[PDB]
Ligand SMILES: [Ca+2]
Ligand SMILES: [Ca+2]
Ligand SMILES: [Ca+2]
Ligand SMILES: [Ca+2]
Ligand SMILES: [Zn+2]
């Protein structure tokens with residue numbers, strides 16, 4: 001049996017459950033660190049989709065661990081390799097899985113959502129959903145590779161060299177996009193939100209301005225920076241309609257927009273912004289490919305500093321405090337330690 | 340004095356007006372052919388914007404003619420050169436005009452809208468808004484260079500080689516985009532509308548299928564062509580919300596969308612189509628640059644056949660019949676002759 005954080009009955013209980021089975025193509029991962037994700041607080045809340053999807057089962061899916069066992073068909077891994085992995089495990093043999101487009105596999109299950117999650121001592125997943133972490137990258141950073149991949153997918157969508165970048169949303173992914181943008185040559189990087197704590201973190205991660213748009217005018221900020229013509233690149237991270245609206249209004253002619261945050265169903269936009277300015281809008285799908293993760297590793301190996309994004313660390317026994325910190329909204333990523 | 344087609348009092352009267360003045364940087368064009376544009380029928384109707392903007396003045400802006408006079412500062416033109424030209428004349432000396440982005444000039448006037456138009460024996464415009472037509476291109480084709488430029492701007496936005504292309508809207512610009520798409524290597528080219536006449540013209544210009552979506556199911560058509568995965572490229576020409584909705588639903592993963600038609604203000608779209616499929620959406624601004632027109636000439640010189648797009652020709656005295664044909668909706672482009 002193994003210790004785990006489960007939805008036994010809101011909240012999560014520190015339960016105890018049997019270890020997972022290892023198929024012919026599975027790796028067995030002994031978990032070292034797990035981050036608390038935005039999906040996780042929905043489960044903790046026993047909220048909308050939480051009451052509709054969780055089997056009731058331990059949750060979680062942002063993790064790093066060391067391989068302790070593998071099936072007899074697993075290729076390319078040693079016992080002892082440190083790995084992180086994706087949030088959704090796929091079939092691995094369909095045409096789409098075989099070509100790396102596992103976001104297209106017709107049989108995806110969510111780790112910690114549809115099946116056993118990473119909030120347990122041991123995690124079994126298919127080898128093709130695992131990603132080896134090199135020893136120069138810490139466990140805490142490895143544990144957030146999945147949201148880092150979304151930030152990278154969004155922020156590297158366009159060339160940023162000497163470009164002015166607007167980011168709407170200072171959640172963890174938006175804050176990582178700030179640091180990426182400066183790393184890859186952006187000029188002005190302006191991020192907006194309504195949370196002073198999250199924006200202060202963004203400033204510490206290199207934002208030119210971190211603008212609380214309920215306290216300060218984005219237009220004023222642009223005039224302060226001598227860029228009244230508008231931004232070259234906009235990364236929409238929040239999914240909030242007013243943020244999207246303000247981002248489109250703030251783009252210059254020929255501006256490029258990456259859409260990561262998911263708008264509500266009846267979101268109307270001013271398509272005159274898109275057409276008259278010739279904007280390019282690119283949807284950033286949720287489940288990035290491992291080619292993104294290889295660029296992630298390379299950036300970390302080049303001195304990209306993501307460390308400020310980790311604001312709280314707790315032992316797994318003290319998981320209650322980690323969800324509290326996440327809930328306040330005054331946190332970056334929160335790490336649970338399983339040592 | 341010169342003969343002209345004016346809004347003297349709905350409809351347009353064959354009036355008689357003084358010739359235009361020639362500034363230092365103007366060319367004076369003796370008009371040969373003029374096409375009836377979608378803006379023109381709005382003026383003929385005395386409709387929404389027509390009652391709000393026309394000075395009451397001769398209208399029109401799709402033209403070809405021969406230069407008969409020029410100002411003393413005009414460069415690069417001979418008396419006798421055949422020219423077409425853009426729908427909006429600009430200042431020509433601002434930073435944006437000097438770099439060819441006259442769609443960005445802060446002082447643009449609409450030919451036949453804000454100022455004297457092309458429905459007259461003589462037309463004066465700034466030399467930098469004129470474009471020389473080579474002798475191997477007929478006058479009738481030259482007269483439609485402006486909508487042809489919009490079709491080219493839209494259809495060449497993406498690489499089409501071996502790609503399946505969906506075009507929504509079989510107006511003249513959509514029909515020209517069909518012929519362009521096949522010329523530049525597209526595989527399946529499917530166009531939709533609700534007008535059987537316009538679709539039949541599209542079929543004659545090379546459409547794989549021309550689908551009346553009130554009589555026939557686009558989904559059925561795609562299953563007939565073994566492309567259930569969806570289209571690679573979608574060109575939205577109509578501005579109709581249901582057409583836009585159906586186009587987004589019909590794109591495959593990684594699909595590319597060019598947005599030429601202008602949606603109504605409160606158009607909501609399903610952004611899940613954009614994000615989950617990773618679609619790329621590009622706004623096609625109304626006033627394309629002359630780099631587009633040079634590609635247009637090159638395609639015509641390579642055997643692109645636009646001739647079927649001209650469905651009616653009338654003398655200028657018989658202009659009443661030309662507006663009648665345009666109004667029925669059973670026409671391609673309609674040419675008025677001024678010889
Ligand atoms: Ca991810
Ligand atoms: Ca710039
Ligand atoms: Ca045009
Ligand atoms: Ca295809
Ligand atoms: Zn699969």
Ligand SMILES: [Zn+2]
Nearest residue numbers: 430433436444
């Ligand atoms: Zn200008």
